[PDB]
Write a protein that holds these residues in place. Structure first.
Motif, mmCIF file in Angstrom:
data_model
loop_
_atom_site.group_PDB
_atom_site.id
_atom_site.type_symbol
_atom_site.label_atom_id
_atom_site.label_comp_id
_atom_site.label_asym_id
_atom_site.label_seq_id
_atom_site.Cartn_x
_atom_site.Cartn_y
_atom_site.Cartn_z
ATOM 1 N N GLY A 113 46.041 58.770 57.605
ATOM 2 C CA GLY A 113 45.186 57.479 58.168
ATOM 3 C C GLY A 113 44.654 56.630 57.049
ATOM 4 N N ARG A 114 43.927 55.448 57.655
ATOM 5 C CA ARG A 114 43.368 54.649 56.853
ATOM 6 C C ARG A 114 41.978 54.238 56.832
ATOM 7 N N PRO A 358 23.299 42.113 38.495
ATOM 8 C CA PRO A 358 24.936 42.442 38.214
ATOM 9 C C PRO A 358 25.265 41.283 36.731
ATOM 10 N N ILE A 359 26.127 41.786 36.017
ATOM 11 C CA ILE A 359 26.225 41.093 34.822
ATOM 12 C C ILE A 359 27.548 39.963 35.014
ATOM 13 N N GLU A 840 40.132 25.057 52.166
ATOM 14 C CA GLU A 840 41.134 25.595 51.029
ATOM 15 C C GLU A 840 41.149 26.775 50.708
ATOM 16 N N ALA A 841 42.190 27.366 51.128
ATOM 17 C CA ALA A 841 42.278 28.782 50.678
ATOM 18 C C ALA A 841 42.647 28.941 49.235
ATOM 19 N N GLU A 842 43.215 28.171 48.904
ATOM 20 C CA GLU A 842 43.855 27.855 47.410
ATOM 21 C C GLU A 842 43.378 26.151 46.981
ATOM 22 N N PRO A 951 50.885 46.688 40.047
ATOM 23 C CA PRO A 951 50.173 45.572 40.670
ATOM 24 C C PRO A 951 48.595 45.673 40.789
ATOM 25 N N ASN A 970 39.895 46.026 40.471
ATOM 26 C CA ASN A 970 39.007 46.164 41.258
ATOM 27 C C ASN A 970 38.940 47.465 42.267
ATOM 28 N N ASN A 1005 32.871 43.419 34.953
ATOM 29 C CA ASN A 1005 33.173 42.009 35.264
ATOM 30 C C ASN A 1005 33.286 41.259 34.108
ATOM 31 N N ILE E 3 36.600 30.974 51.773
ATOM 32 C CA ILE E 3 37.787 30.967 51.744
ATOM 33 C C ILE E 3 38.523 30.904 50.654
ATOM 34 N N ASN E 4 38.301 29.832 49.442
ATOM 35 C CA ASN E 4 38.853 29.569 48.416
ATOM 36 C C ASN E 4 38.776 30.730 47.323
ATOM 37 N N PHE E 5 40.038 30.980 46.594
ATOM 38 C CA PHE E 5 39.975 31.798 45.495
ATOM 39 C C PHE E 5 39.087 31.520 44.640
ATOM 40 N N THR E 6 38.893 30.547 44.218
ATOM 41 C CA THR E 6 37.767 29.991 42.871
ATOM 42 C C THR E 6 36.359 30.790 43.296
ATOM 43 N N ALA E 13 31.410 39.300 40.569
ATOM 44 C CA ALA E 13 30.408 39.284 39.600
ATOM 45 C C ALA E 13 29.456 40.199 40.151
ATOM 46 N N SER E 14 28.996 39.766 41.364
ATOM 47 C CA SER E 14 27.763 40.497 42.279
ATOM 48 C C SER E 14 28.208 41.150 43.402
ATOM 49 N N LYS E 17 34.916 44.558 44.364
ATOM 50 C CA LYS E 17 35.987 44.952 45.174
ATOM 51 C C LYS E 17 37.121 43.787 45.532
ATOM 52 N N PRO E 223 51.408 53.060 59.716
ATOM 53 C CA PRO E 223 50.764 54.033 58.506
ATOM 54 C C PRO E 223 49.183 54.551 58.944
ATOM 55 N N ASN E 224 48.546 53.997 59.634
ATOM 56 C CA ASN E 224 47.229 54.176 59.952
ATOM 57 C C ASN E 224 47.174 55.190 61.039
ATOM 58 N N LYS E 304 55.390 48.914 44.490
ATOM 59 C CA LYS E 304 54.457 48.068 43.981
ATOM 60 C C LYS E 304 54.292 46.715 44.421
#
Lengths: 1135, 72, 165, 225, 331
Positions: A113-114, A358-359, A840-842, A951, A970, A1005, E3-6, E13-14, E17, E223-224, E304
């Motif tokens: 399961g997950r 946290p550092i 903006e997701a990116e 990956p 991570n 980090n 939302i943004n990656f940056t 850092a805090s 995951k 798969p779950n 992968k």
């Protein structure tokens, strides 16, 4: 073959939740502090929070709680690791001996399961029938909290509410019910059910799903007589019980997000709530009374109690004090009053605790110029965001100080023949003396009949037959303690002034330039016994008695001028026994014949800042196995003192270190003190155990504790920091930080609170219009927030903000580099920025801006447009190497003071990290682990050399060698990859193949090379890293023989070093990713290695049973409990 | 501290594809159930005489529902 | 070896295809707790590679090497699982009846008679049967052969588990 | 933690004569070192005088006094070279001796004043050490002198051109003297340029002459030699 | 909760995951929405390709591809070089699948007999068993010694040690008669999805029958161990309740990756679509449609999640005038 050794340089601090109850005894009030894999057990008393026991488990902890399963007088502690290894623990205290006994243990993971997106959530039935856990999608696991359930057999109940937010066991019901907040097609609701582990079913049910705030996430179970539960969102709180509910929506909680809660009043009437902004609130349940005697709720009120550190967890402890724990900042104990203070607050701080994380970022700079670098870090979050400076000095405990400048020596005297302690302190000065009478802790100036205060004194102190002695430039004065008056005086036969002198119990030694005398001390006489004359002037004398002699040294230590040498004479006749050469143009100032530990050594300090040490044969007057070290710049006065047991010496210099014996060698470490020019040990009534350390300005009295070595200065920013770098030109640190503004009814955002970036001595704002036409942020949404980023000029000594430069609204400062570029000799701070928006997701736009730190102003030097966000930047061969989204771009700095792109590479997903070494570039990614690029100046472009095929989502990266890359992901793992240069094909040659794999349980980090040690000159290197829990680790390279040595050692150590809960070491150590699990390899757990010294000898002998370790010669050597300690020491002194 | 102590132990077990193989390749129905023709007076009224057989590939089947194909 | 430690029992397993081997009758017997844990683990290992299966443990087929302490030193014997249980039952004391051993070991009387028929009657005796004879009865009393004189280690006393009846 | 001294009888200002007496002895010691003579006071006694004198806002007295006294000596040492006696061997000996004797004297003074040197002077931007100051003064007044630099470089290069012609010269002076010019950081400015220009001229003359001396020889042997 | 990656990445850092909220439930939409071609596999000594199906080998040392002529070809996963070629069938191969151990390969044809077969991979590419009634063949998900074949709407389950048939599962009245029925096991190997019907592997009776949403795709298990998709309908395989529907799965041959976090597939009706899609396994929320502009015969991902191997027709999609090549795109 890239074997590595891993240790914790600094124990983790982050308060990963807490547990309170009655764990150490039925009566005690307890608190347990969560530190990832460790637990610190405390008991709270009127005097504060006191430690009981430090324990550890082989695994990160997900669940920790106390319970009493019908019949126990003490609480039992339940723990579940992140690897799903459960245990039931009993506290056992055999008098002074404290440990934890495992009653039950076993794994509670579902094989197929997950797992839940909520992570591992474990809660205990108030009736203690079972512990229930939300572990998997639609799967609730229940384990009977029995005495006989040693294996912790678990049962699986299928859950209709597949996706939940927060589950807690409910009160006001005889059944083992749970009240929870969950998400379904009707929005967020609060519902209840009865768990049944034997039926594997959920029965109904205190109440039905009911509508709660859309932002509702927290559920509080409410103790009888109230029963029921409290649901908390962003703007409102509701209370549910059966078919009825109450609601309130205080503006004081609306303004912040509540993170956690804790019950105070045992009747379920009062709870503490706290947010991430630092507000602590009191939630009061106002009861009504029914005709049937039933207690019900009338209404809900929330008061603001006051300000605290971040409330990651709250554990109310005693009759008023609550522990406010934070993994995002500092922790504290505050009392909750009834009567408000002058601020209107009911929160009274009692004790505080520092959390080194946290550092966010780290840099090491020697700001003391001692050879010991200090680490200045970005740590904490929100209002708790701060800079910290960590320095490696064995702490000094100062008890007293006096402002008496021009001091040239100091000696405690026992003027009262019938007292053990010192009565006076004698101070010598440029051309005078002082004598201070000691009255407990207080002192006063006095006068002794036999004491001179209008002459410079070379030596003063106690001698045999109840006498005091003083030697001045004029004469040698022998004084009797009883009258405190002179009984005998000796005068130089050559009628010359004394230039060197030293006294001891049964005699003194003096010199006038070259001439040298030996004068014996008798009950009331100074008697010249013998004399000689040196070829060159005497620079220093010491006749301290050696071995068991009756106050008389057989040897005379003499320093000499001109030829620069020291010699040993037989004191009674001044016969040469031994001589050594010291140097060329540098004169010795301090020569000693003294002890370290229990052995005799000769010392010699020279006016170049270097010291010599020699082994001393006291019987024959011979020296051997000499050492030479550099301490500072001054000639240094060396003085002997006794420590906790055995003796040592102290360097009275500009670099005030303490020198002690260790592995048949004399070694030293710096003390956290400014400067000492002269020293003497002190044993008075006010100061029975201290040293008096004096310099040319002030005198200080205190102890070299040798307990704390790392001292941390905290400098609050009140804003989350981002990056730190150092510039030698401005003698300042560059810091990137982020403060929060929030939207109200008009004008967009405004500062939520003051912070260092606005509370500056000077400030400015970017005037760039480069992305003016493209910036359209959501500045018209009430309650919304924006990050405001700044580059700060931070004083390297004061750490105040000398200048704060604000970036454009919605402009992030993601990267910071300190370097000079191209042909421009000026060191600049380079900031990588981006335009970041909620839609903006990116990112599509950003820039690289170069600034100069000029006094109180930040001068813009350059503004380079890039395509995408500049997330990371490093120095690269005089050029600026930057990561902009997925593209790594190399920029040349021209004589026009601006950047231009030379070349790039983008064969990746996102260029998450950059590290450089020569022409090699290490690029971290989100799902490609570590990538290796190289610059090819012959082409003017980049070449892809190798990549890791795995990956991995990198949390941080570092370069170990040209073909060796160390990093962490991570998934809380550490690994090292090596390019297979020995390969036959390209698939292999271009692969950065995992060599070592090790699980930390920590999210790394920050990486940086260097360590907090004092540099006075088994493993190589020093890669330091910081984690989200305030932990600082250190990774060093191993040889093949030392890897195998330590590898076999680990296997033996884990046999006797038992974990809490009997949880196998093979769980924590295993490299655990989304795709595979592997046992640790290529790495040594150096914390396990160190832990060897914390077990009893009988178990040490078990560890070394059949323990033969491979050596460089190829020999295998068996080990004994004491020899494997030597192995630990060999690693300990390096890392 | 005991008169006897075991040093070696070689345990033995029999291996079968349970494989939810309480079922049949030609028949479907569970092997402990009646083989279709025994659920009614078809092959026999004696439903209690319907037996189970094992093969050579770690599994079982009804005796009747497989042996009936020998004529085919 | 990745379970952090291991028991005193050096366990191996013989996994027999039911479609190839004779049908055998299992017995639930009083195995040493270490044996129970280890065979359950080995079962778990097999069925984690070849799942959807069950393993039927045959305590009648298994065998062990047992070390016994005598006046002449500690010598090893090759014993059946059932002989092991019979002998291991005498590691606290002796003077037990056949019936008591049967109950104590959890095995059939037929199986126990064979185990004792060798152990207390044949060569290199480990036990001594008081009512000297070849056959074993319910009331027979057994004591430990402290007076054991032999030089061979891993002496075969388990002929009954490789010989027809 | 601060400690209070009660009934604090003190003497924050020690007798002015004591301070001045230590200063005078040290001034005299410098003068005693000058001209490479003996010292009336013992080296340790003087050292203590330095440790004693070098106090808060007092130290500048000693540095300025030794600096001026050293300067006076260095200036006096220009006179022995103010001559027309361009003796390529004797002149070089005299100036090299001057430097080597000066170095020894600066070592003697620095040794006596080592406490000053490692404190007031060392821990200060642009406070040169006693030796460094002696070095700077030595080149400032002696080597920089038109007569001294002209004779020093001419003496050295004249012996060199003679050596190239097959003469026997005092290479021991060429070595010590160029070491001296190196120490003062003058070699690169006063010697090397005039030297290379004359030396390169010799190379040109040597080629044109030597090839035509030994019956038009396998000249490459002369090139390598 | 940026939302943004940056911003999300700095928060690590805090907030470890991943940083912020959602994590993979969001970040998968940034990576599986950006596909770019890296390399292509073609038959050696041929002018134009005829691939119909593919799979990566057990150790991912090579890509296994089936041809229109019933051949199996093995190519170096890195270099693109053909290493081996074997005959399996006399017509187009519909499916290829290796065991986790890599000892044997399951193959089947769209027509040629035996429709399915067990071929050895270790040492010699020989036959272990010929199945003349099985159009489609697939390994179970937990215990791979057991393999399921499909005969129209009938499931046939055999153990590969000999290929002996163990159990069958079928019912013509419950059967939805899907054009491409591919009977499959759930993650726990105790349910079979056959022509839209969920079969109880412990009784061989139907446990549930799903409505005939589609005519081509009978469905795939998540798969779950909770969700099963019938073309577009997402059903609870534990309770047989309908949970969600995703139209983007319509005619999409959606399968899952190793971690069960990514689902992907080609579009169906040379009955092939010209594009393929990726989905977020969290809830089957579609991530992207990849604009290939080539009719896609098949596709597979690797362990992968680095490259997706897609068989694309570069020709006219004729019987002879076709060029089906396997083009790999980086996520």
């Amino acid at each position: 073959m890239s074997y590595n050794y891993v240790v914790t340089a600094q124990k983790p601090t982050a308060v990963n939740g807490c547990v309170t109850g009655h764990f150490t005894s039925a009566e005690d009030l307890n608190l347990l502090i969560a530190k990832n894999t460790r637990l610190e057990i405390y008991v709270v008393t009127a005097e504060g929070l006191r430690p009981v026991k430090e324990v550890g488990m082989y695994g990160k902890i997900a669940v920790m709680e106390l319970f009493r399963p019908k019949g126990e007088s003490k609480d039992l502690l339940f723990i579940l690791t992140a690897k799903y290894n459960a245990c039931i623990l009993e506290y056992k205290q055999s008098g002074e001996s404290i440990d934890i006994i495992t009653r039950a243990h076993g794994n509670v993971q579902d094989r197929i399961g997950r797992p839940s997106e909520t992570g591992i959530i474990g809660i205990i039935d108030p009736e203690c029938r079972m512990i229930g856990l939300r572990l998997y999608d639609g799967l609730f696991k229940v384990i009977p909290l029995d005495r006989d359930n040693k294996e912790l057999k678990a049962f699986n109940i299928r859950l209709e509410e597949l996706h939940v937010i927060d589950v807690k066991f409910l009160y006001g019901c005889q059944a083992p019910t749970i009240c929870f907040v969950y998400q379904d097609p009707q929005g967020r609701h609060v519902k209840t059910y009865e768990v049944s582990l034997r039926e594997k079913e959920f029965n109904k049910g205190p109440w039905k799903q009911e509508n709660v705030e859309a932002e509702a996430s927290m559920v509080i179970a409410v103790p009888e007589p109230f029963g029921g539960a409290i649901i908390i969102g962003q703007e409102s709180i509701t209370y549910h019980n059966g078919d009825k509910y109450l609601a309130i929506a205080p503006p004081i909680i609306k303004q912040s997000t509540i993170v956690c809660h804790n019950r105070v009043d045992p009747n379920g009437s009062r709870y503490l709530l706290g947010d991430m902004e630092g507000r602590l609130f009191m939630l009061l349940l106002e009861k009504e009374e029914q005709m049937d005697g039933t207690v019900t709720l009338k209404d809900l009120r929330v008061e603001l109690l006051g300000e605290t550190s971040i409330a990651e967890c709250l554990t109310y402890l005693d009759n008023g004090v609550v522990f406010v724990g934070s993994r995002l900042g500092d922790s504290q104990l505050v009392k909750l009053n009834v009567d408000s203070n002058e601020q209107g607050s009911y929160v009274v701080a009692m004790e505080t605790f520092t959390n080194l994380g946290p550092i966010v970022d780290m840099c090491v700079v020697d700001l003391e110029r001692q050879g010991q670098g200090q680490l200045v870090t970005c740590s904490g979050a929100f209002k708790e965001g701060s800079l910290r400076i960590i320095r490696n000095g064995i702490g000094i405990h100062e008890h007293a100080s006096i402002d008496l400048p021009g001091i040239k020596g100091l000696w405690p005297l026992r003027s009262d023949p019938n007292r053990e302690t010192d009565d006076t302190l004698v101070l010598s000065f440029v051309g005078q003396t002082r004598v201070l009478m000691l009255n407990g802790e207080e002192v006063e100036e006095t006068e002794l009949m036999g004491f001179v205060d209008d002459q410079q004194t070379f030596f003063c102190g106690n001698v045999a037959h109840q006498q005091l002695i003083q030697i001045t430039s004029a004469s040698v004065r022998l004084v009797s303690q009883e009258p405190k008056a002179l009984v005998s005086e000796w005068k130089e036969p050559q009628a010359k002034n004394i230039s060197v002198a030293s006294c001891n119990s049964s005699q003194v030694v003096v010199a006038v330039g070259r001439a040298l005398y030996y004068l014996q001390i008798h009950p009331q006489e100074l008697r010249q016994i013998s004399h000689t004359e040196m070829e060159h002037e005497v620079a220093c004398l010491d006749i301290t008695p050696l071995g068991d002699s009756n106050g008389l040294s057989p040897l005379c230590a003499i320093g000499l001028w001109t030829d620069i040498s020291a010699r040993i004479l037989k004191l009674p006749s001044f016969e040469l026994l031994h001589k050594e050469m010291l140097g060329g143009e540098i004169i010795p100032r301090s020569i000693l014949m003294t002890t370290f530990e229990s052995s005799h050594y000769l010392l010699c300090a020279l006016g170049d800042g270097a010291l010599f040490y020699f082994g001393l044969n006291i019987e024959t007057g011979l020296l051997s196995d000499r050492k030479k070290v550099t301490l500072g710049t001054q000639p240094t006065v060396l003085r002997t003192f006794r420590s906790l047991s055995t003796t040592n010496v102290f360097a009275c210099s500009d670099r005030p270190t303490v020198i002690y014996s260790s592995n048949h060698k004399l070694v030293f470490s710096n003390v956290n003190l400014k400067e000492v020019n002269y020293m003497c040990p002190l044993n008075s009534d006010g100061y029975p155990d201290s040293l008096a350390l004096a310099n040319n300005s002030t005198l200080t009295i205190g102890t070299i504790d040798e307990i704390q070595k790392l001292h941390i200065r905290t400098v609050p920013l009140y804003e989350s920091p981002r990056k730190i770098c150092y510039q030698e030109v401005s003698q300042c640190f560059g810091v990137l930080s982020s403060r929060i503004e929030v939207q109200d009814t008009s004008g967009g955002t405004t500062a939520l609170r003051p912070s260092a970036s606005t509370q500056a001595l000077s400030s400015s704002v970017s005037s760039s219009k480069l992305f003016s036409s493209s910036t359209a942020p959501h500045e018209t949404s009430f309650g919304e927030e924006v990050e405001v980023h700044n580059l700060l000029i931070i004083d390297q000594h004061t750490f105040e903000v000398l200048h704060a430069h604000q970036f454009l609204q919605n402009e992030y400062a993601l990267s910071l580099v300190s370097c000079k570029l191209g042909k421009d000799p000026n060191t600049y701070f380079i900031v990588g920025t981006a335009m970041v928006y909620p839609e903006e997701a990116e990112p599509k736009q950003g820039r690289i801006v170069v600034f100069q730190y000029s006094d109180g102003k930040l001068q813009t030097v350059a503004e380079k447009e890039v395509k995408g966000a500049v997330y990371s930047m490093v120095e690269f061969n005089g050029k600026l190497l930057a990561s902009i989204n997925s593209t790594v771009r190399l920029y040349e700095w021209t004589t026009e003071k601006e950047l231009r792109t030379e070349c790039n590479h983008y064969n990746n997903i996102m260029a998450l990290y950059l590290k450089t070494k020569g022409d090699f570039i290490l690029v971290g990614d989100l799902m490609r682990s570590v990538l290796l690029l190289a610059y090819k100046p012959m082409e003017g472009n980049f070449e892809e050399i190798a990549r890791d095929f795995n990956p991995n989502w990198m949390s941080a990266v570092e370069i170990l060698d040209d073909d060796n890359f160390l990093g962490a992901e991570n998934a809380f793992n550490l690994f090292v990859c090596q390019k297979d240069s020995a390969a036959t094909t390209d698939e292999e040659r271009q692969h950065l193949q995992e060599v070592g794999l090790f699980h930390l349980g920590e999210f790394v980090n920050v990486f940086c090379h260097g360590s907090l040690v004092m540099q006075n000159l088994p493993t190589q290197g020093s890669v330091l890293f910081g984690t989200v829990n305030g932990m600082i680790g250190l990774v060093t390279s191993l040889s093949e023989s030392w890897y195998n040595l330590l590898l076999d050692m680990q296997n033996r150590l884990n046999k006797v070093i038992k974990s809490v809960g009997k949880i196998e070491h093979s769980f924590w150590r295993s490299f655990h990713t989304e795709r595979k699990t592997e046992p640790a390899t290529g790495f040594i757990d150096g914390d396990l290695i160190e832990s060897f010294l914390d077990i009893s000898r009988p178990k040490m002998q078990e560890v070394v049973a059949n323990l033969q370790y491979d050596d460089g010669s190829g020999m295998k050597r068996e080990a004994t409990a004491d020899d494997l300690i030597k192995v630990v020491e060999e690693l300990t002194r390096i890392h | 501290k005991k008169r006897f102590e075991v040093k070696k132990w070689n345990a033995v077990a029999l291996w079968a594809w349970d494989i939810v193989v309480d079922n049949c390749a030609i028949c479907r129905n569970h092997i402990m159930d009646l083989c279709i023709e025994c659920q009614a007076n078809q092959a026999s009224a004696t439903s209690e005489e319907c037996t189970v057989a094992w093969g050579v590939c770690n599994h079982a089947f009804h005796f009747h529902c497989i042996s009936r194909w020998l004529k085919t | 070896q990745n379970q952090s430690d291991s028991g005193p029992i050096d366990l191996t397993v013989n996994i027999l295809t039911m479609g190839y081997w004779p049908t055998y009758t299992p017995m639930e017997v009083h195995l040493t707790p270490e044996m129970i844990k280890l065979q359950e683990v080995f079962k778990a290992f097999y069925l984690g590679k070849h799942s959807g299966r069950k393993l039927q443990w045959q305590t009648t087929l298994g065998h062990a090497v047992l070390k016994a302490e005598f006046k002449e030193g500690k010598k090893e014997f090759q014993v059946s699982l059932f002989q092991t249980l019979v002998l291991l039952m005498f590691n606290e004391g002796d003077g037990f009846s056949f019936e008591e051993i049967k109950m104590a070991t959890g095995i059939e009387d037929s199986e126990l008679r064979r185990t004792l028929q060798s152990l207390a009657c044949g060569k290199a005796r480990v036990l001594i049967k008081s009512p000297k004879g070849k056959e074993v009865e319910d009331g027979d009393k057994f004591i430990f052969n402290g007076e054991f004189k032999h030089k061979l280690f891993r002496i075969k006393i388990n002929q009954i588990q490789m010989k027809e009846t | 933690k601060k400690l209070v001294i009660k009934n604090f009888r003190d003497r924050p200002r020690l007798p002015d004569n004591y301070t001045q007496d230590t200063w005078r002895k040290l001034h005299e010691a410098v003068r005693a070192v000058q001209s490479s003579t003996s010292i009336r006071y013992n080296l340790e006694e003087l050292y203590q005088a330095v440790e004693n004198l070098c106090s808060h806002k007092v130290s500048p007295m000693l540095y300025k006094q030794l600096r001026q006294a050293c300067e006076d000596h260095v200036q006096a040492q220009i006179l022995p070279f103010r001559e027309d006696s361009l003796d390529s061997v004797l002149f070089l000996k005299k100036i090299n001796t001057c430097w080597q004797d000066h170095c020894r004297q600066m070592i003697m003074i620095r040794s006596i004043f080592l406490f000053l040197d490692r404190t007031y002077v060392l821990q200060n931007s642009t406070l040169p050490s006693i030796w460094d100051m002696g070095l700077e003064l030595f080149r400032t007044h002696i080597i920089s002198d038109k007569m001294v630099q002209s004779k020093t470089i001419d003496g050295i290069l004249l012996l060199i051109e003679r050596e190239r012609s097959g003469e026997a010269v005092d290479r021991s002076l060429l070595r010590s003297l160029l070491g001296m010019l190196s120490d003062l950081q003058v070699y690169k400015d006063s010697f090397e340029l005039k030297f290379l220009e004359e030396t390169n001229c010799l190379y040109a003359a040597e080629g044109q002459r030597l090839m035509q001396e030994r019956e038009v020889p396998e000249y490459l042997n002369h090139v390598s030699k | 909760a940026p939302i943004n990656f940056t911003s999300r990445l700095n928060r690590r850092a805090s907030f470890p995951k991943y940083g912020g909220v959602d994590g993979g439930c969001f970040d998968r939409h940034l990576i599986f929405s950006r596909f770019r071609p890296i390399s292509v596999f073609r038959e050696a000594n041929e002018d134009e390709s005829g691939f119909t199906c593919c799979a990566f080998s057990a150790r991912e040392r090579f890509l296994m591809l089936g041809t229109c002529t019933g051949q199996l070809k093995l190519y170096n996963v890195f270099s693109g070089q053909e290493e081996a070629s074997y005959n399996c069938h006399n017509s187009a191969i519909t499916h290829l699948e290796p065991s986790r151990d890599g000892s044997l390969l399951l193959t089947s044809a769209t027509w040629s007999q035996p429709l399915s077969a067990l071929w050895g991979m270790k040492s010699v590419f020989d036959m272990k068993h010929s199945f003349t009634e099985d159009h489609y063949v697939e390994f179970s998900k937990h215990s791979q010694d057991r393999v399921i074949g499909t005969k129209g709407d009938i499931a046939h389950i055999y153990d590969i040690q000999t290929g002996n048939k163990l159990l069958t599962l079928f019912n013509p009245d419950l059967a939805n008669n899907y054009k491409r029925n591919c009977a499959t096991f759930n993650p726990t190997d105790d349910l079979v999805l056959n022509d839209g019907v969920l079969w109880d592997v412990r009784s061989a009776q139907a446990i549930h029958k799903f409505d005939k949403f589609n005519m081509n795709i009978s469905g795939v298990f998540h798969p779950n161990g909770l969700e099963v998709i019938i073309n577009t309908e997402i059903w609870d395989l534990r309770t047989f309740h309908l949970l969600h529907t995703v139209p983007a799965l319509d005619q999409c041959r959606v399968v899952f990756n190793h971690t069960g976090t990514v689902m992907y597939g080609a579009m169906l009706q040379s009955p092939f679509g010209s594009s393929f899609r990726t989905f977020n396994a969290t809830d089957y929320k579609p991530i992207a449609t990849i604009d290939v502009k080539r009719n896609i015969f098949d596709l597979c991902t690797d362990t992968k999640d680095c490259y997706l191997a897609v068989i694309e027709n570069q020709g006219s999609m004729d019987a002879l005038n076709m060029d089906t090549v396997c083009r790999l795109y980086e996520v």
